[PDB]
Amino acid sequence: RRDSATHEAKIAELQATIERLTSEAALAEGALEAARRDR
Amino acid sequence: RRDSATHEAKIAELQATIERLTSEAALAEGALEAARRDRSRLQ
Amino acid sequence: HAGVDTARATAIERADQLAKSAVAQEKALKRAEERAQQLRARLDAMQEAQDQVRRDSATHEAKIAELQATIERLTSEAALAEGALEAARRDRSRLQM
Amino acid sequence: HAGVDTARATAIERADQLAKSAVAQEKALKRAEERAQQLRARLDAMQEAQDQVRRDSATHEAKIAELQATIERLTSEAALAEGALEAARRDRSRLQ
Amino acid sequence: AELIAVRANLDQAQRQIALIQAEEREVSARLAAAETALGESDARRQTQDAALEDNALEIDRLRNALLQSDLKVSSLDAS
Amino acid sequence: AELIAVRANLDQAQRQIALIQAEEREVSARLAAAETALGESDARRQTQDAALEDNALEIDRLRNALLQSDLKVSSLDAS
Amino acid sequence: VQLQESGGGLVYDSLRLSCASSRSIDGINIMRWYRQAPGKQRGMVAVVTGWGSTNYVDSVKGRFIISRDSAKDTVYLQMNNLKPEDTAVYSCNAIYRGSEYWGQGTQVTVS
Amino acid sequence: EVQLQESGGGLVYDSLRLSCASSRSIDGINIMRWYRQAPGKQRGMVAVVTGWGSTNYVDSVKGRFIISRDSAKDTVYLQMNNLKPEDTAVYSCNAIYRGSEYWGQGTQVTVS
Amino acid sequence: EVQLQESGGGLVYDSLRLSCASSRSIDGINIMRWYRQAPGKQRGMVAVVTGWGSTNYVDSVKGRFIISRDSAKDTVYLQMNNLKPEDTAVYSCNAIYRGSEYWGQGTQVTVS
Amino acid sequence: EVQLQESGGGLVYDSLRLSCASSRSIDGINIMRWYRQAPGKQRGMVAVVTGWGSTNYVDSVKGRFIISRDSAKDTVYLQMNNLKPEDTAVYSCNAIYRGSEYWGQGTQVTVS
C-alpha cells in the first residue's frame, strides 16, 4: 500500500547514480585513457 | 501487489548493473594509472 | 880526346835511354789522368744521385707530416662522433630502462 | 882534337837535368796515384752513404704504408659509425 | 698460416741479396785494380821489349865494329 | 693477395739468384783472365830485367874492348 | 542474448549505426557503443540508459548521438560530422542482468 | 548536502585504517568510493562500496585493501593491509547521493 | 686553402653523379668525402676516397654508390646508381688538407 | 699481430691510472685507443693518443682524463682524475698496427 512509494525512491536515487557513473566513465574510459596515451 | 513485484526486479537490476558498471572502473583506472606511469619517461 | 871519346858515346845512350824513359812516363801520366777522370765522372754522377734522393726524403717527410695532420683530424672527429653522438644516443635510448 | 872536348857539354846536359827532373815525374805518378786512391776511398764512402739513405727511404716508404694502413681502416671505422647513427636515427622514424 | 714458410724464403732471398751486393762490389774493385795493374804491366813489358830490340841491335853493331877494328890492328902490325 | 704477392717476392729471390750467376760470370771471365795475365807478364818482367842487366854488362865490356882497341890502333899507327 | 549491428561501410559525412537486440522492450539497462581503431585498444563512444540519459566521450561530444527506439527494440548511434580519425570498428555492448554482452562488430572507415 | 570528513591518517614503517565520516544517509549509502592523490600527480582510484555491499578494488591494491560499510555509525572503512611504500598519498573519500558528488578535506598516509 | 665546389645536383625519377671541384691539391689528395644533410636532419657521411684510392662507404649506400677520384682534373666523383626517394638530400663535399677541414657550398639532390 | 694487456684496474670511493702494455712497435706507434663498455651497453671510445703525442678525448671525459704515451716501457697510459660514479665500465685498450685492429681483455673498474 504505502511501501510502493519508497520503491520509486529506490528507483529514482539508484538510477540517478548510474548517470554519474556513466559521466565519470566518459572522462576515464574514453577520454583520459585515449588522450593521455597520445601524450 | 503485482505492480510492486515488478518494482523488485528493476531494483534488483539497477543494483546489479551498478555492480558490473563499477567493475569496469576498477579495470579502467588500472590502465589510466598505467598510462600516467608512462609520464615518468617524460618527467 | 884520349878518354873523352867514350864519354861522348856513353852519355848519348845515357841521354837516349832517358830520352825514351820520358816518353814512357808521359804516357804513364796521360793514362793516370784518364783514370782520374773516370773516377771524377763516377763521383759526380753519384753526387747528383745522392742529391736526388735528398729531396726524395724531403718529399717523404712532407708526406709524413701531412699524413699525420689528417689522422689528427680523423681522431678528433671520432671524438665527437664516437663519444658524443653514440653515448648520448644510448643515453637517450635508455627509455627502455 | 876539338869537336870532342866540346861535344861532351851537350851530352852531360841530358844526364844531369833529366836525372833530377824525371824524379819530379815520378812524384806526380805517386801524386796522381794518391788522388786516385783518395777518390777511390770516397767512392766506397759514398756507396755506404748510398746504403744508409737507401734504407732511410725504404723506412719512410714503410711509414707511409703504415700511415695509410691506419687511414684505410680508420675511415672504415667511421663508415660503420655512420651506419650506427643512421640505423639508430632510423629508430626515431617509428616514433616521429 | 703459410706466411711462416713464405717469409722464411723471403729472408733467405734478402740474405742472398746481401751476398750479391758484397761479392759483386768486392769483385768489381778487385777487377778494376787487376785491369789497371795489367795495363801498367803490359806497358812496362813493351817498353822493355823496345829496349831489348834497340840494344840487341846496338850489341851486334858494336861487335861488328870491334871485329873490323881488330882487323885494322892486324893490318897495321903487318905494316 | 699476399699469397701471389710474396710468391712473386720469392720469384724476385730467383731473379737475384740469376744475378748470382752474373757475379760468378764476372769472376769466371774477368778476374780469372786478369790475374792469369798479370802473373804471366810479371814473370816476363823479371826475365826481361835480368836480361837487361846482362845486356848492360855486355855493352860495357865490349865498349871497353873498343876503347882498348882504339888505343892500340892509335899507338900502332903512330908507329 | 544476441546483439547484431549494422550500418557499417566505407564512405566519403554522417552515418547511422543500429544494434539489434533480442528481447527486453525498455527493460535492459546501460547500452553502449565501443570502437577500436586498428592498432589501438577498444574504447567507449556512447552510453544510453533505461530512462534515456545519455553521454559521450569528449572525443566525440557534439557529434555522435546515442538513441533508443523501444518499439523497434534497437539502440541507434547517429554518427555525424565524421572525421578521418573515426575509422574504427564499432561494436555494440550491453549490460543485461549484469553479464556484459557484445556484438559481431561492424567497421566504418572514412577518408 | 552530505558532508564527508576523512580520517585515519598517520605514518608507518604496516597496516593502517581509514574512515570517512558521513553527515547523513543511514542505510541509504550508495556509492562511497575512496580516492588517493599521489603527490604532484592526479587523483586515484582505490575501491568502491554500495548500499548492497558489492565492493571492488583497483588492480594495484586488489587483494590487500578491504572497504566495508558501517551503516549504524555512518562511515565507510578503507582498510590498508600488506602495505607498500608506494602508498604515500593524500587520501580523500567520495560520495554520490541524489546524483551529486561530495568530497572531503582529505587526509594523508605516509608509508616510508 | 682548398676551395671546393659541388656540381651535378638536380632531380631524378635511376642514376645521378656528383662532383667536388677542388681548387688546389693536384694529386696531393688525402681524404675527400661526401656528406648529405637530410632535409630537417643532420649531416652524415656517405663515401670516402683517399690518395691511394681506398674507397669505403656507409652501409646505407654500400653496393649502390661509387666514390671515384679523378686526380688529373682536380675533382672527386660520387657516382649515384639505383636510387630511392630516401636519397632526397642536400649533398656536400668535404676535404682534409694540412689538417684543416674544408666544406663545399653544396648542391641539392631531390629524388622522388 | 699484437697482444694488448691492461693494468691499473680497481675500486675506490678517488682517482685512477689505467695503463696498457703492448707486444711490439717501440715508438713506431700509430693510433692506440682506450675504450670502455658500460654493462649491457655497446663498447665506446674515450681517449686516443697517437704516436706523436697528439691526444683527443670524448666530451664526457675531457678536463678529467689524460692519456699519455710511454715509448720506452712499450706501454700507453690513461690517467683518470676526479673519477665520477658514472664512469664505471670495462676498459679495453686498443691499437691499429698494420691496418687491422687488435684488442685487449679489459679491466672492470668500479667507482661508487
Side-chain angles (χ1 to χ4, degrees):
Chain A
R1 187 172 291 172
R2 52 185 59 92
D3 291 350
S4 72
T6 60
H7 277 170
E8 283 92 12
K10 270 191 178 177
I11 295 296
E13 215 286 331
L14 202 60
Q15 195 277 333
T17 177
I18 207 161
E19 310 196 324
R20 186 45 81 99
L21 268 58
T22 49
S23 167
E24 293 179 353
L27 291 63
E29 164 71 6
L32 295 188
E33 292 266 44
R36 186 164 291 174
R37 294 158 176 179
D38 284 354
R39 288 179 188 169
Chain B
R1 304 151 221 161
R2 73 282 189 191
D3 283 332
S4 71
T6 55
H7 292 133
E8 286 183 354
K10 198 172 312 304
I11 303 172
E13 181 80 47
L14 265 173
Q15 175 61 265
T17 179
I18 285 179
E19 291 174 351
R20 291 190 187 161
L21 188 153
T22 56
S23 77
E24 291 166 356
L27 282 75
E29 205 150 355
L32 188 52
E33 275 190 346
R36 293 170 182 172
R37 270 203 188 196
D38 291 349
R39 277 192 176 178
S40 65
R41 288 166 192 170
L42 315 185
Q43 291 167 339
Chain C
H1 180 66
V4 184
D5 291 331
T6 312
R8 277 193 59 253
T10 302
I12 286 169
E13 283 86 5
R14 160 142 289 262
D16 282 346
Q17 289 173 341
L18 283 72
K20 274 151 291 303
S21 190
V23 161
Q25 290 278 355
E26 280 171 348
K27 196 65 52 62
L29 286 190
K30 286 172 184 176
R31 79 163 60 99
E33 282 173 348
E34 282 179 355
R35 280 142 60 191
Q37 266 175 335
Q38 309 310 114
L39 287 185
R40 282 177 184 171
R42 293 183 62 187
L43 274 162
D44 286 350
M46 185 179 288
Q47 272 179 335
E48 182 65 26
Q50 181 181 3
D51 283 350
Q52 282 175 335
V53 182
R54 175 161 291 175
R55 64 210 160 290
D56 281 345
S57 73
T59 60
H60 272 184
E61 301 204 321
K63 274 195 179 177
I64 301 299
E66 190 276 331
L67 215 60
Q68 306 175 342
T70 187
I71 297 169
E72 298 195 329
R73 180 50 55 111
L74 279 71
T75 58
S76 168
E77 303 182 330
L80 281 84
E82 184 79 8
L85 291 183
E86 301 295 328
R89 273 164 45 195
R90 298 134 180 192
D91 278 356
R92 284 181 183 173
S93 187
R94 275 189 176 174
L95 298 181
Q96 268 176 316
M97 183 278 288
Chain D
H1 325 282
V4 183
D5 287 330
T6 62
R8 195 200 216 255
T10 175
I12 314 162
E13 288 165 350
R14 322 295 186 276
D16 289 348
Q17 286 174 336
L18 282 71
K20 294 172 182 177
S21 79
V23 177
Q25 287 288 348
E26 285 170 348
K27 282 175 212 158
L29 261 190
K30 291 173 184 177
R31 284 176 186 169
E33 271 174 349
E34 280 167 350
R35 291 199 206 162
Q37 286 176 336
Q38 283 179 335
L39 300 178
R40 211 186 308 290
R42 291 211 301 118
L43 265 168
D44 280 344
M46 273 205 180
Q47 277 175 334
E48 291 175 351
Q50 277 318 101
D51 281 347
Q52 280 175 334
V53 190
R54 174 77 268 171
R55 268 87 47 77
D56 280 332
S57 69
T59 53
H60 276 305
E61 287 180 354
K63 195 172 310 322
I64 297 169
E66 272 185 354
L67 277 169
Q68 182 74 295
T70 60
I71 292 180
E72 283 180 352
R73 286 185 184 158
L74 177 79
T75 58
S76 74
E77 282 168 14
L80 282 72
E82 198 71 29
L85 282 166
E86 284 186 346
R89 276 198 223 167
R90 271 204 190 196
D91 281 351
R92 270 183 177 177
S93 65
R94 298 171 191 173
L95 322 177
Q96 290 167 337
Chain E
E2 211 194 9
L3 292 179
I4 297 169
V6 181
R7 297 301 183 192
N9 298 325
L10 176 60
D11 288 343
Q12 284 181 336
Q14 291 175 337
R15 294 171 190 169
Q16 272 174 339
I17 297 167
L19 283 176
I20 291 174
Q21 294 178 335
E23 189 68 26
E24 274 181 350
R25 287 177 185 171
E26 289 176 349
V27 167
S28 65
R30 187 183 175 279
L31 174 58
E35 272 185 353
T36 56
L38 186 66
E40 296 176 353
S41 187
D42 282 348
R44 283 183 184 171
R45 178 257 308 275
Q46 288 174 341
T47 54
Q48 292 170 259
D49 278 332
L52 289 174
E53 294 212 320
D54 282 342
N55 289 354
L57 291 178
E58 183 178 1
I59 277 165
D60 291 331
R61 300 165 189 168
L62 196 150
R63 286 186 201 163
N64 302 344
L66 174 58
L67 269 162
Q68 302 173 336
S69 73
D70 281 328
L71 298 175
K72 278 204 171 186
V73 179
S74 69
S75 74
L76 282 178
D77 281 329
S79 184
Chain F
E2 289 210 9
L3 290 168
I4 302 166
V6 185
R7 275 171 187 164
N9 214 344
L10 305 189
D11 296 351
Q12 277 211 64
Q14 298 174 333
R15 297 171 187 175
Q16 292 135 355
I17 291 168
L19 306 191
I20 295 171
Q21 281 177 334
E23 189 277 331
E24 290 174 350
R25 280 184 182 175
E26 293 179 353
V27 167
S28 84
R30 292 282 86 73
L31 293 188
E35 275 189 352
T36 48
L38 189 151
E40 299 172 351
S41 89
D42 264 355
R44 198 185 284 101
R45 192 71 32 73
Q46 286 179 335
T47 66
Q48 283 194 290
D49 275 287
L52 269 179
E53 286 178 354
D54 217 341
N55 205 34
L57 292 184
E58 292 163 358
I59 296 170
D60 278 343
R61 276 191 179 176
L62 292 157
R63 199 186 297 270
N64 285 336
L66 279 177
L67 316 188
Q68 312 319 111
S69 191
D70 296 343
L71 283 168
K72 295 177 181 179
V73 174
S74 59
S75 64
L76 304 171
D77 206 48
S79 174
Chain G
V1 297
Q2 191 197 276
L3 311 163
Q4 186 42 60
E5 51 274 15
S6 59
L10 160 69
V11 294
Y12 298 174
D13 302 82
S14 68
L15 206 53
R16 322 194 77 263
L17 294 166
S18 298
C19 165
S21 175
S22 295
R23 65 196 72 181
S24 298
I25 308 290
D26 203 49
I28 297 169
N29 277 107
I30 312 285
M31 284 74 74
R32 308 163 259 124
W33 275 80
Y34 282 64
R35 71 180 182 179
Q36 180 172 354
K40 300 178 75 68
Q41 294 82 17
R42 199 175 302 112
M44 200 199 81
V45 176
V47 168
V48 70
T49 300
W51 294 12
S53 179
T54 61
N55 83 7
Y56 322 97
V57 55
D58 306 318
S59 296
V60 298
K61 273 192 170 70
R63 311 211 317 274
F64 295 8
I65 282 172
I66 193 67
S67 172
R68 279 179 52 211
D69 173 23
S70 300
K72 191 173 179 180
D73 181 319
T74 298
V75 55
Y76 294 74
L77 176 62
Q78 206 51 58
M79 182 179 72
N80 63 38
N81 210 313
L82 279 167
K83 299 179 181 182
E85 296 178 355
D86 283 308
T87 292
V89 63
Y90 290 68
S91 74
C92 71
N93 201 51
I95 297 169
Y96 171 40
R97 212 202 168 98
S99 56
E100 181 179 18
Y101 299 107
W102 281 58
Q104 295 191 341
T106 59
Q107 183 170 5
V108 173
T109 303
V110 298
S111 279
Chain H
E1 284 183 343
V2 65
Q3 206 179 287
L4 301 194
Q5 180 35 65
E6 288 89 344
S7 308
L11 168 62
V12 291
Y13 289 169
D14 282 12
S15 43
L16 200 56
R17 205 154 168 202
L18 321 167
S19 304
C20 169
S22 178
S23 179
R24 52 197 73 177
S25 294
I26 309 296
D27 204 47
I29 289 175
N30 258 315
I31 297 169
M32 295 299 291
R33 40 192 154 189
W34 262 79
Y35 292 169
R36 63 189 202 184
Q37 183 170 352
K41 296 288 290 184
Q42 290 278 86
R43 212 168 296 128
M45 181 85 167
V46 176
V48 301
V49 70
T50 316
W52 269 56
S54 86
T55 70
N56 76 347
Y57 313 85
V58 73
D59 310 342
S60 179
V61 310
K62 182 61 182 294
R64 301 200 290 111
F65 293 166
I66 295 169
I67 178 163
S68 84
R69 284 178 63 196
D70 200 356
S71 194
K73 206 151 55 51
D74 205 37
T75 298
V76 166
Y77 296 127
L78 177 55
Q79 183 77 1
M80 313 275 278
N81 297 323
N82 291 323
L83 281 176
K84 296 183 290 294
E86 295 180 352
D87 286 332
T88 293
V90 172
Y91 274 86
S92 53
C93 71
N94 170 16
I96 297 89
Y97 293 116
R98 209 197 161 89
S100 47
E101 202 169 18
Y102 292 103
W103 305 70
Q105 274 187 331
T107 186
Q108 193 181 31
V109 169
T110 312
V111 297
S112 291
Chain I
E1 285 184 344
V2 65
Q3 202 176 291
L4 300 175
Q5 191 56 257
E6 288 80 336
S7 297
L11 160 66
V12 288
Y13 276 57
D14 284 18
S15 63
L16 205 62
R17 208 177 152 208
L18 289 163
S19 303
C20 167
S22 167
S23 168
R24 75 142 191 81
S25 294
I26 293 281
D27 204 47
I29 288 165
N30 279 319
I31 296 165
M32 271 205 308
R33 49 199 164 185
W34 278 91
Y35 284 74
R36 57 188 204 186
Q37 176 182 352
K41 301 197 56 50
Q42 296 279 83
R43 205 171 303 133
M45 182 179 72
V46 180
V48 167
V49 73
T50 313
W52 274 90
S54 69
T55 67
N56 73 276
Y57 319 87
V58 181
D59 291 331
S60 183
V61 298
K62 170 67 178 293
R64 208 159 93 255
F65 281 170
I66 299 166
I67 178 64
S68 88
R69 260 171 57 213
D70 180 23
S71 200
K73 197 166 72 176
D74 220 336
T75 315
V76 68
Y77 292 125
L78 176 55
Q79 176 71 46
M80 284 211 165
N81 272 316
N82 288 329
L83 295 172
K84 320 169 186 181
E86 294 177 353
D87 280 321
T88 292
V90 178
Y91 279 89
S92 68
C93 171
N94 201 37
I96 291 176
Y97 291 111
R98 212 193 167 90
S100 59
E101 189 174 14
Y102 280 88
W103 290 117
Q105 264 181 328
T107 66
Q108 192 183 29
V109 172
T110 309
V111 58
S112 280
Chain J
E1 281 182 345
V2 298
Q3 187 201 274
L4 294 174
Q5 185 64 255
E6 292 83 357
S7 66
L11 166 66
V12 297
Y13 270 99
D14 289 332
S15 58
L16 206 54
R17 193 181 221 281
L18 273 179
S19 180
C20 165
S22 179
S23 179
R24 54 151 40 91
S25 296
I26 296 289
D27 204 44
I29 283 176
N30 270 328
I31 290 175
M32 326 189 76
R33 292 175 283 175
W34 261 86
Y35 288 76
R36 60 185 205 195
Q37 179 177 355
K41 305 178 75 69
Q42 311 283 84
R43 210 182 309 118
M45 187 203 81
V46 298
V48 167
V49 72
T50 313
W52 294 272
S54 71
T55 69
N56 76 339
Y57 313 123
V58 307
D59 291 330
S60 179
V61 298
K62 292 177 71 68
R64 284 205 331 258
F65 294 0
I66 297 89
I67 187 155
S68 57
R69 271 184 67 222
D70 202 2
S71 296
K73 215 175 86 176
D74 204 323
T75 304
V76 64
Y77 319 132
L78 173 65
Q79 193 74 40
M80 293 180 183
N81 300 351
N82 290 317
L83 269 169
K84 292 179 181 182
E86 158 153 1
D87 284 316
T88 297
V90 298
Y91 293 83
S92 50
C93 85
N94 190 51
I96 296 173
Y97 291 150
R98 211 195 173 96
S100 86
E101 190 180 18
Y102 300 99
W103 288 98
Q105 293 180 337
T107 61
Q108 176 165 1
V109 165
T110 313
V111 286
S112 280

